[PDB]
């Protein structure tokens, strides 16, 4: 009955002073906006239907039209920024926040969904949603003794919407908003549903992407052990944001990095550094690079867990982006490590794959590797073994590459390469 | 030497 209407038919029904005709026209609009194949969103907007849908949200006397309009507005807000803006300009934000208190679960859920789309557009709309006071009624919906009593889809939508309030930077979410959300976020992080867990980890990863003060807020909540536990999950959609979160945390201070190590995260890295999914392998190596940029006792933890041969393996064979992160892990290792630790790196066979990457057509990684070779030679000077190191580099074709790098297009590349030649060869 | 670093919108389908 309300299937495949024209836009003018929808306008005609909505413009009538008949609430039932309006309900039927609104449902027809919803079904139009629900077809996966190019929904006529711009046509609906140009017809000036948005303010009508928003007004229908306030009709507590007629819950079906509240639901249909909420669904319709949800799908419009799911589109482009201009389409989302059109929904916001219609005054939908405070109207949807009022619907969060609806006695009908499917209606309040739709309001949660719609606010999620609006907040997900960017920092501005995210903060505007917060300013309208969305956080309190959102969190109130999760104020139950046991989350398992809530409908599965209902809980998933709430978690997803909450993660959008944690999303985006420039600027990051308000500090007072993050502090208000965090306790609920921690509780969701201990739930048993994979999708809730995935979105909870994404939310945490968003909050940990920034200044160390932002990281500290999260770490203070004691979520690191749970993040490490989720790091060993079988579900890839859980491991990915959990790894991202852990990776963000170790970009902070040595003390914050230590929390990750103490939680036992390093024991998961043999799997992560050999993970079939390339992006997991890249972010794990990136995480390792920031850990090897820490204290010497933290570098020692990496050694004790037997992660150095895994770094050699990644450097030897991986996607190039992952190998680039491995080069960083090595340069950071050699920069801050003890002579004993640097010697161990060579004994594990770091030289050959390090030299093989000097033939990469990437200026930055060449710089990074040259810094590593430099730092390794410095450790050889303290032991009087620079001659032995020079031979190793000579035996694997490393000297040939360093020599040809003397005539390289970059300034510091040609500088460091020629410096290495005359100093050790 | 530290180096710093779920769809935003979803339509409801039948
Ligand atoms: Cl924005
Ligand atoms: Cl892949």
Author numbering:
A (entry chain B): 72 to 496
B (entry chain A): 244 to 248, 268 to 276
Show me the paper's own sentences about this structure.
The X-ray cross complementing group 1 protein (XRCC1) is a scaffold that plays important roles in the overlapping single strand break repair (SSBR) and base excision repair (BER) pathways, and participates in other repair pathways as well.
The Impα(70–529) was chosen because this construct, with the Importin β binding domain (IBB) deleted, is identical to that used in previous crystallography studies by Fontes et al.. We note finally that a comparison of the sequences of human and murine Impα(70–529) indicates that none of the residues that differ between the two species makes contact with the hXRCC1 NLS peptide ligand. The importance of an extended conformation for the major motif is indicated by the presence of proline residues before, after, and within the XRCC1 NLS major motif. These residues eliminate helical conformations while favoring the extended conformation that is observed in the Impα complex.
